[PDB]
Amino acid sequence: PEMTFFSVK
Amino acid sequence: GSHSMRYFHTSVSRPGRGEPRFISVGYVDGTQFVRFDSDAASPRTEPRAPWIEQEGPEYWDRNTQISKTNTQTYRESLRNLRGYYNQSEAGSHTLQRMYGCDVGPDGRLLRGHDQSAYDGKDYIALNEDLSSWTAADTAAQITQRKWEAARVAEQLRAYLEGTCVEWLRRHLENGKETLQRADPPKTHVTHHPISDHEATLRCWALGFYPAEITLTWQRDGEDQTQDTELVETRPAGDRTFQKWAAVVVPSGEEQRYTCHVQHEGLPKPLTLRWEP
Amino acid sequence: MIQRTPKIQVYSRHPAENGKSNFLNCYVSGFHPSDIEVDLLKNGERIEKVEHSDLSFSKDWSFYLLYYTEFTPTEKDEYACRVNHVTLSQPKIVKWDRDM
Ligand code: NA
Ligand code: NA
Ligand code: NA
Ligand code: NA
Numbered sequence: 557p558e559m560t561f562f563s564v565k
Numbered sequence: 566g567s568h569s570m571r572y573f574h575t576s577v578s579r580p581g582r583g584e585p586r587f588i589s590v591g592y593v594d595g596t597q598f599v600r601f602d603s604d605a606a607s608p609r610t611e612p613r614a615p616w617i618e619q620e621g622p623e624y625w626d627r628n629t630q631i632s633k634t635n636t637q638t639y640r641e642s643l644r645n646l647r648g649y650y651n652q653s654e655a656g657s658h659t660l661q662r663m664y665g666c667d668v669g670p671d672g673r674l675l676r677g678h679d680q681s682a683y684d685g686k687d688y689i690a691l692n693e694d695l696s697s698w699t700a701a702d703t704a705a706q707i708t709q710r711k712w713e714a715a716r717v718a719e720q721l722r723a724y725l726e727g728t729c730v731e732w733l734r735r736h737l738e739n740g741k742e743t744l745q746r747a748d749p750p751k752t753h754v755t756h757h758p759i760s761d762h763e764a765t766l767r768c769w770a771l772g773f774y775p776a777e778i779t780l781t782w783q784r785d786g787e788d789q790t791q792d793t794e795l796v797e798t799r800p801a802g803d804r805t806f807q808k809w810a811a812v813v814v815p816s817g818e819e820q821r822y823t824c825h826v827q828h829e830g831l832p833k834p835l836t837l838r839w840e841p
Numbered sequence: 842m843i844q845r846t847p848k849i850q851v852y853s854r855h856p857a858e859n860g861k862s863n864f865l866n867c868y869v870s871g872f873h874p875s876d877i878e879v880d881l882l883k884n885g886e887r888i889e890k891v892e893h894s895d896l897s898f899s900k901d902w903s904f905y906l907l908y909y910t911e912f913t914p915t916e917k918d919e920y921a922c923r924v925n926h927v928t929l930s931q932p933k934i935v936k937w938d939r940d941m
Contacts, residue, residue: 575898577874577875577876684874687902755940799852802866
């Protein structure tokens with residue numbers, strides 16, 4: 557599965 | 566051989582036309598296997614290769630929730646990036662990211678990736694150490710500071726060394742009949758007269774997989790790289806790829822020219838000449 | 842903005858055999874931004890059943906798409922690809938040439 561990107565840029 | 570799993574994320578703002586569209590597509594080597602599109606009538610992670618269809622409901626639901634969350638994060642990212650570059654509310658902008666793992670023939674992690682770009686320019690990338698960042702400009706240094714405080718690199722490292730490699734290996738096994746099958750190119754040399762003095766020799770490679778190939782013309786054994794028109798490798802539509810290379814040769818000198826084809830699917834590299 | 846103009850290749854899935862069914866491909870690549878309009882044309886008119894791939898991009902961040910449709914080549918019929926993009930002053934038409 558994909559990764560949930562832990563922060564907005 | 567070596568293998569990779571990669572995800573390609575595109576988010577595009579469209580002021581006046583709703584919220585930024587988010588699309589994610591997943592690949593194993595050259596084979597697309599999933600998609601998510603926030604513009605679909607019912608956004609969900611959807612299979613795009615047959616072998617992935619045997620994954621169970623929890624795989625699809627987990628991926629759908631991740632992509633809906635990522636949809637919101639990229640939209641907040643796009644707002645922040647607009648601020649960082651002092652850009653108006655009225656323009657369309659693009660935020661791209663690609664991430665994934667490469668493994669060697671023995672399934673061991675070769676390296677991980679996590680790169681982002683804004684309006685087509687590199688913005689920030691996780692270094693090969695999976696522990697530090699390369700920021701392209703002072704804007705990305707703000708992002709870098711946020712991600713260092715939130716320890717994003719440590720969490721990316723965990724994903725890339727754990728989940729990514731494990732699931733790549735699982736996919737390679739479930740899809741071995743296609744992912745681990747190299748299809749060699751079908752090859753031919755065509756001949757296209759230009760004038761009394763010159764003709765085009767075009768070397769064809771059709772139907773091959775994976776996309777990696779070397780297709781070269783030689784004159785008396787010297788590589789003709791500078792005089793070769795090499796088209797970009799192109800998808801055939803059936804999972805395989807096509808490519809050709811052409812040189813313009815003096816009329817009557819055709820036999821001094823050889824086309825050489827190397828591909829993982831060939832028992833032996835090929836040497837082709839014009840057969841009238 | 843970085844803007845990159847599309848490359849366009851129009852070609853068939855299989856070598857073309859007049860009268861034998863086939864697939865017409867228009868592969869647009871290397872462009873930025875992602876907004877693009879692509880039509881497949883038969884004798885200058887737009888073909889209606891045209892599918893396309895999910896938007897993705899290359900290592901240099903430039904986008905690519907494959908538009909395709911079923912078709913049967915013939916000596917008289919002329920097929921083409923018509924692409925519009927912010928980098929082009931007019932839509933570009935590329936004719937299908939069965940030797941390319
Ligand atoms: Na928007
Ligand atoms: Na499903
Ligand atoms: Na933005
Ligand atoms: Na971008």
